[PDB]
Design a protein around this ligand. Structure first.
Ligand SMILES: [Ca+2]
Ligand SMILES: [Ca+2]
Ligand SMILES: [Ca+2]
Ligand SMILES: [Ca+2]
Lengths: 109, 109, 109, 109, 109, 109
């Protein structure tokens, strides 16, 4: 059974009070500015709950939408006939070309 | 100049061929296996690119939408009086009741 | 005693409840996402039991078998007369050639 | 692009010879010691190819089938109404008891 | 003072049940498979006792006998006059030629 | 194709000279210091080869026999009726009693 871990986002004064009382408080002074803090926490995904002063989280739904979309992803390339990289003998080569011809990259392998 | 790391998702025999060639090949026998491989690769972190047999990724956009999304989220909680939680002299107790009052679920702090 | 580690896979809001309560819940919205979850999980060897919402696991037998079949395997090459590789002065090259005769894939040793 | 690694499973003396020659040889004196080495190599994870002295491999289809079944089972327990672990505030109690009804087993959480 | 580490080897269903109870159960279905399991545990090192279903250990003296003949060893080469290697300036080359003079093998150092 | 690892066990100053020339020298001043070092190298696991000064190796077949046939074993306990440990209600303690029962030793589990 696991530690439940909770973050609190409030105004910087208030967050310092939270800190001094033994809780995990984070200062934010505007909303957008809170939202970025949230991605960072759902990032470092210790937390079961983030309590946010409501003036700093007026649209809970929209904030959710945005964190999810800050995930840096690799490029994904679908390919027809991967099998045919074994037809010859520079497989690495064949993929370097394959990719280069698809996305225009001399992807730096 | 950072290293470009590429992974390859193909049918299991094809994935074996890539690995024998010194490429990072991973085998999957279906769409949903491919997607779970994507999450593992994302979770791990250093891939600029995943190349996927397109019978296993017919829809890079859908797949991307699940990587950004998949996330289990924290209960995100906008709270109307965090500042009042310094009025008493047990902040930890006040906050525990504030969650319980609110979302019904008692939280384990 | 050694702990017993359990995971619970459920509807996304019930999963958050499990987290708040100190258990190790995971949200999933369909049967797919749920086996995609399983996959991701079952390679993280720690869990002894997995409790899954009946709705997201209409067949606990077949879900097993999918997961068994998901393991990436080295190519297994039985060889007669492995020892012959020491008749000459080139075991690496002997082996690379043996692999190629046998499996067609020219391994990069 | 990565190190291409092969292991060789042979009789102890032969395995010593391969290790002298720069290859990763493991010695086995029975089929089961080889099957155990296969599983260990696989669970370690870095091998594209495993060569095995045929005299050590009674049935290579079977040996794969065992590696596929060798992921080593987290008991799986489909459950009707997980939601209602929030009727009363002992989510854990409920779980250990439910599990005990279902699986006929106590569990140590 | 430090708790005695014990493993249990039993048929897979039972082995699963010992795990749910917090104990270290490992599943096997034959005398040979089980001896393999003894050897992996023995090599792996931390156990003071292994309790084995007798159906899986019908000959436990022969079992000991074997555990202690599965250890992979280096080739052990006694040499006269190892010093004399310091008289002519290519110690590594001297040693290469030595080993080859004694066992036939050109070693890759 | 991997680097071949060799060690050299010789008198302390000869071993220092092996190190100054880039080889893996280990000093021993007695037969029993030499046998310790072999055990330590065997136990690390890499070495294709261990060259030992003959003066430190009174009996090489004894040396090998001690390597195989000497490391400290797990007591090995065949048991009748392990299944019967669940059909109590306290497996952990039913097991404490059953091993004491047998060997005589209230072992520290
Ligand atoms: Ca981003
Ligand atoms: Ca989820
Ligand atoms: Ca796979
Ligand atoms: Ca061995």
């Amino acid at each position: 059974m696991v530690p439940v871990r909770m973050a609190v986002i409030a105004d910087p004064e208030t967050a310092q009070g939270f800190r001094l009382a033994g809780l995990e408080g984070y200062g934010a002074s505007s909303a957008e500015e809170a939202q970025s803090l949230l991605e960072t926490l759902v990032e470092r995904g210790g937390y079961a709950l983030v309590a946010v002063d409501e003036a700093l989280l007026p649209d809970p739904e929209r904030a959710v939408e945005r964190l999810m979309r800050g995930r840096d992803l690799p490029v994904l390339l679908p390919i027809a006939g991967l099998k045919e990289a074994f037809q010859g003998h520079d497989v690495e080569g064949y993929m370097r070309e394959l990719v280069r011809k698809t996305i225009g990259f001399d992807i730096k392998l």
